[PDB]
Scaffold this active site. Structure first.
Site, mmCIF file in Angstrom:
data_model
loop_
_atom_site.group_PDB
_atom_site.id
_atom_site.type_symbol
_atom_site.label_atom_id
_atom_site.label_comp_id
_atom_site.label_asym_id
_atom_site.label_seq_id
_atom_site.Cartn_x
_atom_site.Cartn_y
_atom_site.Cartn_z
ATOM 1 C CG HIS A 185 58.571 34.510 38.779
ATOM 2 N ND1 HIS A 185 59.872 34.340 38.280
ATOM 3 C CD2 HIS A 185 58.536 35.736 39.362
ATOM 4 C CE1 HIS A 185 60.561 35.458 38.522
ATOM 5 N NE2 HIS A 185 59.766 36.330 39.177
ATOM 6 C CG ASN A 210 60.813 58.085 33.734
ATOM 7 O OD1 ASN A 210 59.834 57.487 34.221
ATOM 8 N ND2 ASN A 210 61.486 59.025 34.375
ATOM 9 C CB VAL A 230 58.198 60.477 31.843
ATOM 10 C CG1 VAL A 230 58.130 61.719 30.936
ATOM 11 C CG2 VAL A 230 58.412 60.892 33.289
ATOM 12 C CD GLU A 278 57.082 56.375 25.858
ATOM 13 O OE1 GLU A 278 56.883 57.014 24.831
ATOM 14 O OE2 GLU A 278 57.491 56.878 26.914
ATOM 15 C CG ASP A 334 60.435 31.565 36.342
ATOM 16 O OD1 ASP A 334 59.249 31.761 35.959
ATOM 17 O OD2 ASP A 334 61.055 32.302 37.112
ATOM 18 C CG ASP A 337 71.667 39.545 42.477
ATOM 19 O OD1 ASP A 337 71.522 38.998 41.362
ATOM 20 O OD2 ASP A 337 71.307 39.038 43.567
ATOM 21 N N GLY A 351 61.436 43.109 40.751
ATOM 22 C CA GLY A 351 60.910 43.929 39.649
ATOM 23 C C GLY A 351 61.715 43.766 38.374
ATOM 24 C CB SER A 373 60.720 38.997 37.992
ATOM 25 O OG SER A 373 61.258 38.379 39.144
ATOM 26 N N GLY A 374 61.709 38.333 34.821
ATOM 27 C CA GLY A 374 61.234 38.124 33.437
ATOM 28 C C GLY A 374 62.107 38.826 32.412
HETATM 29 C C1 LIG Z 1 64.392 38.813 40.991
HETATM 30 N N1 LIG Z 1 65.473 37.851 41.151
HETATM 31 C C2 LIG Z 1 66.491 38.169 41.901
HETATM 32 N N2 LIG Z 1 67.703 38.302 41.429
HETATM 33 C C3 LIG Z 1 68.616 38.238 42.442
HETATM 34 N N3 LIG Z 1 69.154 38.334 43.451
HETATM 35 N N4 LIG Z 1 66.474 38.369 43.217
HETATM 36 C C4 LIG Z 1 65.959 37.441 44.211
HETATM 37 C C5 LIG Z 1 64.963 38.100 45.148
HETATM 38 S S1 LIG Z 1 64.081 39.452 44.333
HETATM 39 C C6 LIG Z 1 62.602 39.659 45.386
HETATM 40 C C7 LIG Z 1 61.625 38.529 45.365
HETATM 41 N N5 LIG Z 1 61.854 37.355 46.069
HETATM 42 C C8 LIG Z 1 60.798 36.593 45.856
HETATM 43 N N6 LIG Z 1 59.896 37.213 45.062
HETATM 44 C C9 LIG Z 1 60.398 38.454 44.744
HETATM 45 C C10 LIG Z 1 59.647 39.404 43.871
HETATM 46 CA CA LIG Z 2 58.053 56.150 29.147
#
Ligand SMILES: CN/C(=N/C#N)NCCSCc1nc[nH]c1C
Ligand SMILES: [Ca+2]
Ligand SMILES: [Cl-]
Length: 223
Positions: free
Chosen positions: A40, A54, A57, A62, A84, A171, A175, A177-178
């Site tokens: 995704h 950061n 920065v 890096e 996924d 949780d 952002g 994700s992955g």
């Molecule tokens: C990222 N996974 C997660 N972990 C947990 N809770 N969160 C679930 C929702 S996060 C925001 C979102 N929902 C759909 N698309 C996007 C970018």
């Molecule tokens: Ca940096």
């Protein structure tokens, strides 16, 4: 990451930021030339950023390396988020050191109760929005299959596990994700999906990496 802590610069040396003009997804370095992320997170124009704390920065550790090839899992379903997982090959080999290091793939699947380290640059709030610039960390247990399925009836496949807290407050989020779920030095999960972030009875859902190890090794060996 919601309800986590500041990891500390380069303390998660396999954590990568995927960049298309801005951080949009995490990933995990699994050898000098390959990153594992979520399907995704697929798009073109990816620059892989390693040695990052950061992301706004230049701090001196890096490595910025363009993706030559993305491979979304053959069976990825963007509607169910089943399978996924995606591989990214770097245009050049990363220079591996204490601050840039691969994470081991699992030889066995992890079990409910196993404590894991989840990390990313995602949103830090349950309600509202604040993006940290430095890497955030959460220690979370893997939840039982039965809890995970009760939390998300009709939605959890054999390629998914829940990790986190049914009481909420802690949780992964937008952002992250992955990004990696590491349990005893092994990449056991990929930040995949959830219902909002850190809500009661709506824990994070992770790609079950142990199911994908033979596809990963096969793909690396021929690409
Ligand atoms: C990222 N996974 C997660 N972990 C947990 N809770 N969160 C679930 C929702 S996060 C925001 C979102 N929902 C759909 N698309 C996007 C970018
Ligand atoms: Ca940096
Ligand atoms: Cl169970």
């Amino acid at each position: 990451i919601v309800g986590g802590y500041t990891c500390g610069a380069n303390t998660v040396p396999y954590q990568v930021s995927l960049n298309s003009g801005y951080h949009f997804c995490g990933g995990s370095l699994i050898n000098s030339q390959w990153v594992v992320s979520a399907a995704h997170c697929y798009k073109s124009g990816i620059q892989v950023r390693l040695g990052e704390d950061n992301i706004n920065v230049v701090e001196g550790n890096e490595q910025f390396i363009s993706a030559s090839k993305s491979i979304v899992h053959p069976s990825y379903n963007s509607n169910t988020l089943n399978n996924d997982i995606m591989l990214i090959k770097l245009k050049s080999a990363a220079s591996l050191n204490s601050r840039v290091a691969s994470i081991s793939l699992p030889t066995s699947c992890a079990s409910a109760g196993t404590q894991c380290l989840i990390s990313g640059w995602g949103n830090t709030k349950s309600s509202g929005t604040s993006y940290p610039d430095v890497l955030k960390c959460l220690k979370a247990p893997i939840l039982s299959d039965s809890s995970c399925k009760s939390a998300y009836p009709g939605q959890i496949t054999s390629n998914m596990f829940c990790a986190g807290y049914l009481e909420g407050g802690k949780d992964s989020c937008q952002g992250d994700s992955g990004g990696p779920v590491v349990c005893s030095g092994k990449l056991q999960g990929i930040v995949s999906w959830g219902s909002g972030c850190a809500q009661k009875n709506k824990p994070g859902v992770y790609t079950k990496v142990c199911n994908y190890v033979s596809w990963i090794k096969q793909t690396i060996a021929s690409n």
